């Protein structure tokens, strides 16, 4: 009797779900870094100029 | 001439969780019909051992 009948007689499923997640990720990351340069210059130059005047 | 050297170093630790859960209900008709005698079958077994059944 009652309204429930209803519910068998047209075959009814109810389903639920309930997923809850939890996540902590920790990341150390250390860097270290040397560098070194050594340069070395040198130049040489030579010049002449030669100047006569007439006046 | 320059040189160099890197270094380094990366770590990472990670928990999860997950739970979970569901209920899932199947309404037939075959299941009531089944449901009609399992109360009254108690008191077969009663009646068949313990009383009396002659008039």
Same mark, same amino acid.
């Given at each position: 009797?009652?309204?429930?009948?209803? =519910?068998?007689?047209?075959?009814?499923?109810?389903?639920?779900?309930?997923?809850?997640?939890?996540?902590?990720?920790?990341?150390?990351?250390?860097?270290? %870094?040397?560098?070194?340069?050594?340069? =070395?210059?040198?130049?040489?130059? =030579?010049?002449?100029?030669?100047?006569? %005047? =007439?006046? | 001439?320059?040189?160099?050297?890197?270094?380094? +170093?990366?770590?990472?630790?990670?928990?999860?969780?997950?739970?979970?859960?569901?209920?899932? +209900?199947?309404?037939?008709?075959?299941?009531?019909? +089944?449901?009609?005698?399992?109360?009254?079958?108690?008191? +077969?077994?009663?009646?068949?051992?313990?009383?009396?059944?002659?008039?």
């Amino acid at each position: 009797y009652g309204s429930d009948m209803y =519910k068998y007689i047209e075959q009814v499923t109810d389903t639920q779900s309930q997923d809850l997640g939890k996540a902590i990720e920790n990341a150390i990351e250390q860097g270290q %870094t040397k560098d070194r340069q050594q340069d =070395k210059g040198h130049e040489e130059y =030579k010049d002449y100029e030669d100047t006569i %005047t =007439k006046s | 001439l320059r040189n160099g050297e890197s270094d380094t +170093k990366r770590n990472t630790q990670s928990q999860n969780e997950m739970n979970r859960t569901g209920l899932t +209900k199947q309404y037939l008709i075959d299941n009531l019909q +089944k449901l009609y005698s399992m109360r009254d079958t108690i008191f +077969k077994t009663y009646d068949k051992e313990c009383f009396l059944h002659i008039w």
